[PDB]
Amino acid sequence: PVTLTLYNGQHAATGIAIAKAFQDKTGIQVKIRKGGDGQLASQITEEGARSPADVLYTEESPPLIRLASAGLLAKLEPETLALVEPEHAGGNGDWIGITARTRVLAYNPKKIDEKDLPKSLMDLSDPSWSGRFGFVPTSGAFLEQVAAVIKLKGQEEAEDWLTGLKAFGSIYTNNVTAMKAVENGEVDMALINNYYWYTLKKEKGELNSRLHYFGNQDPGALVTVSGAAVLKSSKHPREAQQFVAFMLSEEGQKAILSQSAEYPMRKGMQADPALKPFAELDPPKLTPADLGEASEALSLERDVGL
């Protein structure tokens, strides 16, 4: 008769799938509140000790870092933390990575050959790309991408870069519409996360668009971590801890990956071989903790007006 409340920043189908698999294993019912990572983080911030949320599940790590710094998250059970590499968990062990996603340049090969794509993410502020690419300034992983450009290239070059994106990029409300616009022939390329192509490929059967990976430790090769945590205010701590642990069990990871084409954070578990091999991503040397709350990046987004 215990009911957990899950605040789900991950994509709706993904949260529904993991919560269902946890219900089928344990008998515990999971009520879901779906929202944006930051929206939910702010909701928990204001509800504070009165929040009904038992577990929070996000697409990206800054909201977990933010909440962990506020003291709102519970220390996770050591057996749960032992399931991932330590750089994929909070430094104080009160949130844990569940899957990783990575930044891509989706493109339409009918409208641009692969050899003619930008060689670096930093190239997209050049005027020659004007009208040719989409990006998503409200996106949680885009915000991490900005943070990464600041850390790797410094504030002055990040500001110039993002000024160029505002001048020359095309704004999409979310990654789904950016991906569709590349597929539909409406924009030559777009910066999104890797898994969106696999969702559209499942729905339509075959696709015109293709994914380009910057690699080479480029700022654009960033890997970001979707994570989860138990709320310190939870009146069901044991059951909430079991839920997070189940998310990193083999069955839980598979249930998540059946809805999202992401990389498992469970040690020793491989992603679907249809993904670009994680080892070939060659991302910039940036951890979730390096990206932090992405506060400076958010400031830059607001200053530049995106």
Contact residues for Fe ion (CB under 5 A)?
59
Which run of H or of E encompasses 63? helix 62-69
Q: Is 203 annotated as a binding residue?
A: no
In the complex, residue closest to Fe ion by CB: 59
C-beta closer to Fe ion: residue 170 or 175: 175
59 vs 94 by CB, closer to Fe ion:
59
Give CA–CA dist 125/79, Å, rounded: 45
Q: How far is the CB of 224 from Fe ion (least distance, A)?
A: 10
Decide whether 81 or 190 has the Cβ nearer to Fe ion: 190
Half-sphere exposure of 297 (CA within 13 A, CB side): 23
Nearest Cα to 72, choosing from 89, 91, 88, 95?
95
The distance of closest approach from Cβ of residue 27 to Fe ion in the complex, given in angstroms and rounded to an integer, is: 30
Local structure of 221: helix, strand or coil:
helix
CA distance 195 to 262: 6
Task: Check whether 198 is labelled as a binding-site residue.
Answer: no
**Cα end-to-end distance, the chain, whole Å:** 46
Smaller CB distance to Fe ion: residue 60 or 94? Answer: 60
Rounded to the nearest whole angstrom, what is the least distance from the CB of residue 192 to Fe ion in the complex?
Answer: 8
Encoded amino acid at 11, one letter:
H
Q: Is 47 helix (H, G, I), strand (E, B) or coil?
A: helix
Closest residue by Cα to residue 140 from 242, 271, 38: 38
Q: Quick one: DSSP state of residue 82? A: T
Give DSSP secondary structure letters for 225-268. Answer: EEEEEEBTT-S-HHHHHHHHHHHTSHHHHHHHHTTS--EE-STT
Min. distance of Cβ 108 from Fe ion in angstroms? 21
Q: In the complex, what is the shortest distance from the CB of residue 73 to Fe ion, in angstroms, rounded to a whole number? A: 22
Comparing CB distances to Fe ion, the nearer of 41 and 76 is 41
| 75 vs 84: CA distance, rounded Å | 15
Give the H or E element holding residue 80. helix 78-81
Q: Which is nearer to Fe ion, 40 or 74 (CB)?
A: 40
According to DSSP, the residues that pair with 231 across neighbouring strands are 73
Token pair belonging to 120: 């670096």
CB of 9 to Fe ion, least distance (A): 9
CB of 59 to Fe ion, least distance (A): 5
The annotation status of 236 as a binding-site residue, yes or no, is no
Is 301 part of any known ligand binding site?
no
Nearer to Fe ion, 59 or 293 (CB): 59
Q: Can you say which residues are annotated as belonging to the binding site for Fe cation?
A: 11, 59, 195-196
Q: Can you say which residues are annotated as belonging to the binding site for Fe(3+)?
A: 11, 59, 195-196
Q: Can you say which residues are annotated as belonging to the binding site?
A: 11, 59, 195-196
